[PDB]
Amino acid sequence: LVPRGSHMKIGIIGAMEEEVTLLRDKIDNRQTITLGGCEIYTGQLNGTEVALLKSGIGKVAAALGATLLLEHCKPDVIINTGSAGGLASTLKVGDIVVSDETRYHDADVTAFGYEYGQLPGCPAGFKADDKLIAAAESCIRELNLNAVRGLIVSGDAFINGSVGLAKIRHNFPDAVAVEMEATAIAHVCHNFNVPFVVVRAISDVADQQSHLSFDEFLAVAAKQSTLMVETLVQKLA
Amino acid sequence: MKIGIIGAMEEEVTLLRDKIDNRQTITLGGCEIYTGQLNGTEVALLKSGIGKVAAALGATLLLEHCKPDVIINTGSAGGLASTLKVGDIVVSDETRYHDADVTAFGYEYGQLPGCPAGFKADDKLIAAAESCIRELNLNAVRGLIVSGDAFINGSVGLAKIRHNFPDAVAVEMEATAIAHVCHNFNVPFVVVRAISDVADQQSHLSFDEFLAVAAKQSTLMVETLVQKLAH
Ligand SMILES: CSC[C@H]1CN(Cc2c[nH]c3c(N)ncnc23)C[C@@H]1O
Ligand SMILES: CSC[C@H]1CN(Cc2c[nH]c3c(N)ncnc23)C[C@@H]1O
Ligand SMILES: [Cl-]
Numbered sequence: 001l002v003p004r005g006s007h008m009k010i011g012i013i014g015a016m017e018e019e020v021t022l023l024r025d026k027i028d029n030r031q032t033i034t035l036g037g038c039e040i041y042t043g044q045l046n047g048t049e050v051a052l053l054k055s056g057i058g059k060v061a062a063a064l065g066a067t068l069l070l071e072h073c074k075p076d077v078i079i080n081t082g083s084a085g086g087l088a089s090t091l092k093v094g095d096i097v098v099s100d101e102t103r104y105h106d107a108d109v110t111a112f113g114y115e116y117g118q119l120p121g122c123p124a125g126f127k128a129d130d131k132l133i134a135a136a137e138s139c140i141r142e143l144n145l146n147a148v149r150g151l152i153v154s155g156d157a158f159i160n161g162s163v164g165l166a167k168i169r170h171n172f173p174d175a176v177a178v179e180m181e182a183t184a185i186a187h188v189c190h191n192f193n194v195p196f197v198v199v200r201a202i203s204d205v206a207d208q209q210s211h212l213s214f215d216e217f218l219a220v221a222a223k224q225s226t227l228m229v230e231t232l233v234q235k236l237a
Numbered sequence: 238m239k240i241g242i243i244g245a246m247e248e249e250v251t252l253l254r255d256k257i258d259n260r261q262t263i264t265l266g267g268c269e270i271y272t273g274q275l276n277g278t279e280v281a282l283l284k285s286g287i288g289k290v291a292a293a294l295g296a297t298l299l300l301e302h303c304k305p306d307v308i309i310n311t312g313s314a315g316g317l318a319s320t321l322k323v324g325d326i327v328v329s330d331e332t333r334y335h336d337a338d339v340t341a342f343g344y345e346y347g348q349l350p351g352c353p354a355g356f357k358a359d360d361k362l363i364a365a366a367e368s369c370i371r372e373l374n375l376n377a378v379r380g381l382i383v384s385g386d387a388f389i390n391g392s393v394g395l396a397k398i399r400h401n402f403p404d405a406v407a408v409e410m411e412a413t414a415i416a417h418v419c420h421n422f423n424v425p426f427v428v429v430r431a432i433s434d435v436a437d438q439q440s441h442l443s444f445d446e447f448l449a450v451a452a453k454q455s456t457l458m459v460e461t462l463v464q465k466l467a468h
């Protein structure tokens with residue numbers, strides 16, 4: 001993950017200010033770059049060099065941010081953190097989800113025989129780094145958290161039950177969670193050969209009341225994702 | 238004076254690429270950037286790849302490495318306005334995502350939080366494109382262009398766009414992404430594309446036959462517009 005004779009620098013991307021604020025507060029020797037509407041915080045988290053990006057919401061905002069983070073901070077790994085819609089049958093608010101793979105749920109070029117969710121020039125899904133997944137699962141065991149590991153799907157929609165949800169469940173019956181940035185970040189990471197992993201926490205279960213649940217439990221998810229990410233950064237260094 | 242040009246597919250950029258004198262190429266983040274002069278105007282031509290993220294990645298790279306003064310998005314498009322036929326020109330006055338949906342929290346359909354509901358194209362770039370259309374005597378429509386990560390092929394996907402965006406004149410997969418990135422860096426932007434299909438049940442067949450015609454017409458427009466803006 002890091003070349004010999006150097007320290008690793010960990011990239012951490014969150015979409016919303018709510019998702020990054022706790023981490024931001026814990027950074028020592030913090031400096032801020034405001035670039036292309038994104039904000040990046042650099043410094044140390046418990047002695048490890050980090051670059052924390054608040055990207056804004058959705059696929060383009062996250063691609064833009066990830067690109068900026070890579071060009072300006074050149075991190076060795078990226079961790080995408082935040083909240084997620086829990087799709088897997090045993091998930092509850094505050095549970096952790098770790099990506100083994102990411103895919104776009106709203107990409108459709110099947111008229112030319114690409115797989116549902118696949119964009120031309122891309123693999124059908126992006127596999128997360130094995131070493132980062134292993135590190136996160138060790139964190140989950142040591143912290144004694146409830147987690148699931150699986151496919152995370154991304155689109156530009158907040159999933160709120162009805163036909164939006166039923167579409168995803170049809171096309172990706174094994175997806176464990178849904179959000180709006182992760183696959184975009186994975187896509188950018190793929191193009192630069194940067195190890196990537198998603199570590200998020202459940203704010204809602206993507207059903208008819210997901211907007212109510214999100215408005216009540218984003219804070220819980222931010223807190224649990226933050227604990228995971230702080231723990232992981234230490235394990236990685 | 239430096240003009241950025243972005244197309245998604247090699248087929249969309251190949252004619253312009255061949256025309257650049259003193260050409261240099263940089264391959265980065267999976268994208269290719271070509272630099273040089275196009276009919277005596279300094280350009281940076283990006284081949285981004287297909288879709289919103291590929292285009293956002295590419296546009297970001299173009300900006301940070303080449304710092305163009307304006308960006309023109311070129312290529313093909315699915316025609317939505319009834320007057321359009323294959324080969325006709327569409328120019329953006331505005332772009333919107335047709336697949337963005339955060340309406341559960343009261344954002345407008347197509348709007349992402351932190352963004353305007355849609356991105357207005359640069360008025361001077363639009364006026365300049367309309368003068369090229371006039372002088373070349375081309376058939377053209379000016380209006381809303383919508384973007385998503387789907388190739389539109391009739392049925393329910395077309396019906397949804399027509400319902401949410403009844404005055405959209407064309408659909409594609411990159412333009413709003415590029416507009417979004419340009420909005421963030423205050424870079425003037427316009428889309429000048431040409432029709433390859435009408436986004437109906439046969440759009441895949443039309444695309445496979447007429448992509449080259451659309452590349453030819455969009456390329457003619459872009460060449461003219463670059464000369465006009467620079468000279
Ligand atoms: C204010 S838009 C929601 C923000 C929170 N993010 C994750 C998420 C939680 N629940 C989700 C769901 N049901 N559908 C899609 N995404 C999510 C994505 C976006 O930044
Ligand atoms: C091989 S994917 C198609 C490529 C050409 N681009 C424009 C386009 C033409 N017709 C379209 C349509 N019916 N639906 C969506 N987009 C388009 C989008 C993408 O780069
Ligand atoms: Cl699946």
Ligand SMILES: [Cl-]
Nearest residue numbers: 402403404405
């Ligand atoms: Cl409309």
